[PDB]
Structure formats: structure tokens, C-alpha cells
Design a protein around this ligand. Structure first.
Ligand SMILES: Nc1ncnc2c1ncn2[C@@H]1O[C@H](CSCC[C@H](N)C(=O)O)[C@@H](O)[C@H]1O
Ligand SMILES: Nc1ncnc2c1ncn2[C@@H]1O[C@H](CSCC[C@H](N)C(=O)O)[C@@H](O)[C@H]1O
Ligand SMILES: Nc1ncnc2c1ncn2[C@@H]1O[C@H](CSCC[C@H](N)C(=O)O)[C@@H](O)[C@H]1O
Ligand SMILES: Nc1ncnc2c1ncn2[C@@H]1O[C@H](CSCC[C@H](N)C(=O)O)[C@@H](O)[C@H]1O
Ligand code: NA
Lengths: 258, 262, 260, 259
């Protein structure tokens, strides 16, 4: 009825994803200190990998994205980035001399790249993304980030957290879901709000089970939250979401190896 | 049953959104049944087909000779699943009340909530029993001001107010879909704290959009036919996933509070 | 704090200020419901915690205001000599054996396990107000509650209800609402950047009032900051804003119970 | 038909005890039974006292160092030698009695300087990381990594609450957070009318009033008081125990090939 207002946030799921991936890319940029590289290899195209690889094009002569899933070539939006499936990278490493990266970035996280494969490189810089967020015994047990930091003259660990808030992982998707969930809880406590609905679904399923990157990108193109209320809440909805997005802090911690 | 790799498990809850909706609607229908104490009626009029109205009207067929659902939205006739229930849009009800003699209900149930039926329309009836659903959940100044439940309780020899809350939990309204959303949201919060869980996703969307803007009841019913929650974790969580959701569904308590009058 | 790198900030808002705001809202809700009517004799059951101020607020329009409490030591919580204090035993004996008790205004603030509908039924006042101890829905609490059974006399009847708008509270009790405001405020303050920890200055207040039977000590315990925060950056503004916003959410009103 | 008042059997001191014991066991596990001639622990409050006591078994001499002389009162074993910071610094410059093989820094934020730590050459150095979950302000003032500047074997003592948010690893903070989270859950139990934690600014008693005895008395109180219609004793203790069990303390070895 006209007694109740329906408000869809201006902030879309893709905007939250964008903000998180840009923070991760800037954390890497800052850590690299403008160094130029002949060949950068980034493992893991989903979800921040695509933009991170794009961000390296400026200072890297060649940027290669490596993924175990060949269909993830569809998540790359720049033809300047070379895509290689994991099997073709492993074959080229053994049979050729074209793979000799000076910059290696592992964004695979839990159950990802093996320290054995990383050990085959001798880069100037190695960055490994730490998938751990706040403390969880099970996640900490399966994590092997420290074992992956086994090569490179300069080593760094990319860490991403939500300041003053709890998140189980540093994964782009998890952080976006957590921002939306925390925002809903606070929005629901605003005076006059009847209900608050997050626009969420199992996005990872669209990418990895349905193998449909286009459909996944379409799914991100929608308001993060829908609110039903008696009073106007547009500024409040924006204040809460924006504050939760601003809490994301990404940085590369240098791992000293003398 | 896996995620990005085989090191992570993806678990979809066995409980679907429709199962939660069903549990809530059934509690509201049982609260009305209990209040009516088996009384038989010649003509029952239920205002508001979405969301619990459809099942509530169906539940009255046993003791009511004629059951009529009234809705301001004509397309909501599509949410009725029993041909025994008569549907009338609000305009047809108003005109037949003013110009005919076929509308004289002995049982009136108002489930419209906020911005719904007017006390003026309710005042045109002289039923044996009047039940008005209170849309208010936990206290909210804004919601309490627009609410006029007490003004709608203006006719009937026996009067009752249908109230629905989540025991020891916070909900802004008693609306079926608000309660379902809140059960899922609170369940996600708790599931996320289970050891080894990476993330928890509630399968939610603006369901009111499908029903009132797209005017698609079939699509809405299809949207309810899916897992309430999807969890990404390192260890098995199936047991906890169903237990947490079930515990939250069980907190729903619906009852008709009798409004004393002569 | 432990070093000069950490700041310790005590809220300017004291526990007593929160109590004051809540009791005043309950008294104003009753005032607006009474619509300026004058009474010869008002009887208020339950001195702790809002009862004392509510009885004081009735002095303007009531010739005689009597506070009745089952605990005789609660005469100490009254701050105005104009209010008559009567223990429950004397009231019950006076009702049965005398003619001095015939109130035109009766207010029951005892809540759960309080005054019986049988005692209320002995009065024939112009106005009866019963405080509803229920806050948000709880099956266990709704089962023991008998507010509706207590609203059995009076030409005009009302139920005093108190909630925190958009927040969760199990009861409408003054001290519980204060505790809940402080607890919710701590949770939000802890999430401010640079905060190390947030401590609510709370204790078992009823122990002082009802077990130690020391009203003065209890009043001293309320005379202290509601929250203490340890942080790296200044948080004074946010600390007061969060607490003030939570206090503002308290809403008290008397719902008239129609009886033609 | 009656309102019940229940005080938790678990006292604030029991929660403090459980946290300090986890920190001491994390250090024990990391030391792998190694024996030391002289251990120096910086920071007596709050876990320092018990940690120093726990080192007595494998260390010939255990010394607690604190910038506050009145903190000698928090030591419960006469076998631990107390030294104020000025007396340690004096003995380092003018004497030869201070040459620890085990150094443990538990001072946290605004504590011991890396310059003082650099004066030692121990077999093992352990620095407690005061950071809990991420906070920009706390991360900026923290200098734990700069303090890991000596020792053949280096470790960082980390303490968190599994699946729960805490701003620091400080014993006090963790106890407060366990009680606060427990109250929040207890309040949602059916029939509960109210839940009150017994909390106050304990640090003020120790550092401003300089009264360790009064502080210890303040910990000897039930953590929570609950008012309810139904019995909740079992659930009260279960929620508190489950929150205490979430505390996880461990020493993460800080690899340094040169040392
Ligand atoms: N061994 C391997 N080599 C290359 N890519 C891998 C891999 N194992 C997993 N991947 C890929 O790495 C990604 C894991 S998901 C990583 C999420 C990312 N850290 C973020 O925050 O957005 C997926 O694209 C997956 O297909
Ligand atoms: N004046 C009126 N007369 C009849 N139906 C109305 C109305 N105003 C609104 N409605 C209908 O009443 C419903 C309002 S939504 C009610 C939600 C319901 N109480 C529940 O808990 O599920 C919608 O079906 C709407 O179309
Ligand atoms: N039968 C009875 N008659 C009179 N006073 C009673 C009573 N039973 C309990 N009391 C008193 O009533 C108070 C109950 S506590 C009431 C709290 C109050 N509603 C508030 O919000 O502040 C106590 O003072 C208690 O001693
Ligand atoms: N430079 C210094 N040298 C020695 N002790 C210090 C110091 N600076 C602070 N301290 C002491 O170190 C302690 C800081 S509080 C440390 C809390 C502890 N990590 C816990 O979790 O319980 C206090 O006892 C303080 O007096
Ligand atoms: Na591990």
C-alpha cells in the first residue's frame, strides 16, 4: 500500500565487490613501490584476480592469469591479460623457457596452489594472499599460507579484514556478504523499518557449478538491500552500507627473510 | 556438494523457504481455530489474501458454509489453492454491501495490516465474531503511530486480536514474510559462528516485488521452493544447519487475544 | 590507562541519569492519561523503582498520595515527606477493619508476582492503572503475567506500557530498561575504531535494595558513569551520542482499556 | 509462580584463571621442555603473575619486571623475584647479574621498547601480540614486530576467541568480552527477565588506586546475575563455559634464519 515505502539501496552488490577488489589491488600496488616487472603470474582469476591482473598491466610487460578452471578466462575484461589454465602452465614450465616470472601473486586461498608449484619459480617478488580472516580453528588448520611463501627476494602476505567487525575469511565474496549482512542487521533497527531484505544467493554456484560468468556478473548488478519502512530511510541506508564498506582494510605485510 | 575446490564443502539446507512460510501460516490458522472454539458460521469474510490469508480461508471451510476472501488486488485470486473459497475484489464487496443483500457475515477476519481495511468498512458488518490481525511486532514508534488495529475492532459480539511473535527474538512486524526473513537472518548469524564455516548465505530477495509489482503469484511460489540457506565450510555442518533453523522456526508463537466487550 | 598511549574515558551520563529519564517517561505517561483529573486519595503499589517519583508526580493533583510496599524498609526510597508510606499488612488490615482507605486513583506498579487481583478487587476507584511488566514477547513471561486479571475495577482503566523502540527488552522494569540501554550502548561503542574495551558499570542492584536493604547505598551506586571506555583515540562524542540515542528510544504510554 | 534470581557459580576470577592458564600453556608448548638459567618476564598484570609462576619448573631463576613497583603485590609465589624497570635498567648498565636466556614481553600497547629488548641475547624471546581482531587504530600503535629483535628462537604469543570478535588479546578484555557475549545469549533464553554482568573499571583499581588486594576482591564475584521465571542454572554455566572454551592461545614461531 501507499502507507509503506519500499527502498532499494543505490549501492549494488557489484559496487561492494568493486570497492573490495580495488582495496586489494591498491594494497599490492603500494607494496610493489612502483617496481617494473617483465612477467607477472597471478594464480586465481575469481574474484579479485581479474582486476588485480588488470592493475599490473601498467608496470608489468606481460601479465598472465592462471586458473585451474578454463572457463574463468570469461572473467577477464582486458585482452592484454594472458590466460593460461593450470595444466598448460605446468606443461610450459617443464617443456619450455617462456615461464620465468619476476612477480608471482597467489590469490587461490584455501585448497589452492601448492607450495611445490610456487617453489619452481624464482621471482624478485612473491605475494601470497592470506585467506584467513578472524580466528577460526578449522580455517586456521587447513590454511598453509606460510608454506607457500617459499621463494622470492621480497615476500609479502596480502591480508584483508573488516575493521572492528567479524569475518571468517578475507575472500572478496565473504567480505561482501558480511558487509551486507551486518548492514541489514543495523538497518532493521532504524525507526519505522518493517523489514530488511538482503539480495543474496549462492553466487559462487553460478560461477563454478553452472560455469556461467555472464550470469554471475548480471546477478551482481542489483541493489544490495531492499527495505520496507514507514519513513524515508535513503540517507540512513547509504550511511550504514557505506560505513560497512569503509571498514574493509587491505594491506600487504612484508615477510622479512634475511 | 563442493565449492571452488574439494577442500571446501557447500551445504544447502533441507528446509526450504516455503517450509518456513508453511509453519508460520499454520500457526496463525491454528491460533484462529483455537479462538473460534469450534463455532459454526454461515458466511465468513477474510480480508487480505497474501500471505497467510489463503491458508486461513482454506482452514475455515470445515466450519463455515461460505468462505469469501476479499482483496484490493484482483490478481491475488491466483494465491488461492481451493476452488471452495470465493474471491471478491474490494470494489465488488463494497458495491454488493451498499447495493445488495448477499453480504452479511457472521465471521469477519481482517489480515490486511498496515494501511489496510478501514474501520469504516468494518463498521458496516454485524458479525458474531470479529478477528483483526495486529501487524505490530516488537515496539517501534513509527509503526505504532500508523497502526490502527484498536480502531478496527469496532463490531462483533466476540472480538479478538491475532498476534504473532518470535519468543525471545526481535521482529518489527507479525507479517508472515517478515517473520520468515527474520528466522533465516537470525539462523545465518548463528550458523556463521560454527567452527570451519567460511560464509553463510540466506537465499532472499524482495518477494513482495514478485507478488505486487510483477503480479506473478506463480513465480513467487517458485521462488519459495528453494533452500533457505547455503553454507560454505571446511567441516560437515548439516546437523547444525537444520537444528538452528528448526529452533528459530519453533520460537514463532501465534495467538488470538480476546478483546473484552458487552 | 595502564600507559599514556591509551585513554580511559568515563561517560558523562551516569546510571542515575538513565534511571531518571525512564521514571520521568513513566510518570509523564500516567500524567497524560489522567488528563488533569483531581483525586482525593491515590494509592500506588510498589515503591521501587519508578514508584517513588510517580507518587511524587501525583502530589500536584491528588490530596493524599499513599505508597504501599510489601517491604517496610522501602519507605527510605521516598524523597518527599508529603507521600504517606504504608506497608502491605497495614493496608490489608485497614481495608477489612477501617474506613480510611477508599482510593479514587489506584496504580499498581508491582509487576510479576506482585499485587493480587483479589486485593485490587476491594477498591472502587474512578481510575485504575496497572503497569504491564511485559516487554517483548517471551512465552514463559506471558504465562506468569496476570496484568489483564488485575484490571478488574475502575470507571476508567489503563495499562502502563514501556518499551525501547526498535530494540529488544524482556520487561518494562525501570532497572532492566536501564541495564539494556547500557548493554546495547556497550556493544556499539566497542565497534568504534581504536576502542580496546568497553565496560558497563553494572552490578546486582536488587541485591543492595532488597537483600542488603540499603537504599542510600543503592542511590550511591547509581551515582557513577554508565560506561568506561579504553581507547587509543578520543571517543567522548560517540560515547555520549550512542548512550543518548539508546535512552531516547524509551517510549512509555498508558493504553486505555475500553469498558462501556 | 515465582521470579528466581540466579548468580553464576563461575566467578570473574575463574574466567581470568582460565585465560591466563591458556596463555601459560601456549608458552609451555612453545618452549618444548627447554630448561633456562634465567627468565625475565616484562609485565606483571594480568597474566604475567601466573606465567612467571609457570616458568618456575624449568627456569632456575624467574624475574618479573614492571614499571609500577606496587605490582609486586600481584605475585603469589615468593620464588619469583620482582624488579622495577629502573632497577633492571640500573643493573644492566652497572652489573653482570642480568643475562637472561629466556625473555618474555607481556607489556603490550605502549609497553617495553625494542631498544631495551635489544640489550638482551637470549636463547628464546617471546613477545605477546596485544592485537586481537582487526582495528586500524590499534594496528597503527602496535610495534610487536619491532620488539622481536633478539633471540635464537623467536615467538609471538597470540590469543583470540574462536568465531567471536575481540579488539585485543589482553586478559582483561577477553574476560569482559566473554561475559558480555554470555549475557547477550543468556538474555535470549526463554523466561529470562534480565541479565546483569558484574563489571567495573578493574584497571582503575590496579593502576590508579594502586590497590591489588581490592582488585583481587573485585574478581571474587559471580560473573553474571540472572532474573528468570524458570530454572536457568545449567544454561547459565553452559553459555559461560562455552564462551570461555572459545579462547585459543598459541605462540607462533617467528622464523629468522640469521638468528
Ligand atoms: N591450484 C590452482 N591453480 C590456479 N588456480 C586455482 C587453483 N586452485 C584454485 N584456483 C582458482 O583460484 C580461485 C580460488 S577463490 C579465491 C578468492 C580470492 N582470494 C578472492 O578473494 O576473491 C578460483 O578462481 C579457483 O578456480
Ligand atoms: N483495504 C483492503 N481490502 C482488502 N485487502 C487489502 C486492503 N488493503 C490491502 N489489502 C491486501 O491485504 C494484504 C496486505 S499484506 C498482509 C500480510 C498478512 N497479514 C500476513 O501476515 O501474511 C495484501 O494481500 C493486500 O493486497
Ligand atoms: N503484593 C505487593 N504489594 C505491594 N508491593 C509489592 C507487592 N509485591 C511486590 N511489591 C513491591 O513492588 C516492587 C516490585 S518491583 C517493580 C518495578 C517497577 N515496575 C519499575 O519498573 O521500577 C518492589 O518495590 C516490591 O517490594
Ligand atoms: N616498559 C615497561 N616495562 C615493564 N613493564 C611495563 C612497561 N610498560 C608497561 N608495563 C607493565 O606491563 C603491563 C601492561 S598490561 C599487559 C596486559 C597483559 N598482556 C595481559 O594480557 O594480561 C602492566 O603491568 C604495566 O605496568
Ligand atoms: Na595450518
Amino acid at each position: 500500500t501507499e502507507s509503506v515505502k519500499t527502498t532499494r539501496s543505490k549501492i549494488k552488490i557489484k559496487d561492494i565487490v568493486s570497492d573490495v577488489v580495488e582495496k586489494k589491488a591498491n594494497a599490492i600496488k603500494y607494496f610493489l613501490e612502483g617496481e617494473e616487472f617483465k612477467q607477472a603470474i597471478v594464480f586465481g582469476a575469481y574474484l579479485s584476480g581479474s582486476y588485480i591482473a588488470y592493475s599490473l598491466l601498467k608496470d608489468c610487460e606481460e601479465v598472465i592469469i592462471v586458473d585451474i578452471q578454463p572457463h574463468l578466462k570469461d572473467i577477464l575484461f582486458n585482452d592484454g591479460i594472458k590466460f593460461m589454465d593450470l595444466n598448460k602452465l605446468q606443461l610450459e614450465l617443464r617443456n619450455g623457457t617462456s615461464i620465468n616470472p619476476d612477480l608471482v601473486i597467489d590469490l587461490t586461498g584455501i585448497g589452492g596452489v601448492s607450495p611445490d608449484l610456487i617453489s619452481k619459480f624464482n621471482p624478485k617478488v612473491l605475494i601470497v594472499e592470506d585467506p584467513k580472516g578472524n580466528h577460526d580453528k578449522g580455517i586456521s588448520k587447513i590454511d598453509n599460507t606460510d608454506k607457500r611463501l617459499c621463494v622470492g627476494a621480497k615476500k609479502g602476505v596480502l591480508k584483508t579484514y573488516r575493521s572492528s567487525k567479524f569475518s571468517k575469511t578475507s575472500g572478496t565474496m565473504t567480505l561482501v556478504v558480511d558487509i551486507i549482512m551486518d548492514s541489514c542487521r543495523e538497518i532493521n533497527e532504524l525507526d519505522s523499518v518493517l523489514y530488511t531484505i538482503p539480495n543474496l544467493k549462492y553466487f559462487e554456484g553460478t560461477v563454478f557449478h553452472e560455469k556461467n560468468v555472464k550470469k554471475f556478473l548480471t546477478e551482481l548488478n542489483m541493489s544490495a538491500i531492499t527495505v520496507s519502512s514507514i519513513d524515508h530511510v535513503e540517507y540512513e541506508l547509504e550511511e550504514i552500507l557505506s560505513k560497512n564498506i569503509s571498514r574493509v582494510d587491505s594491506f600487504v605485510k612484508e615477510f622479512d627473510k634475511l
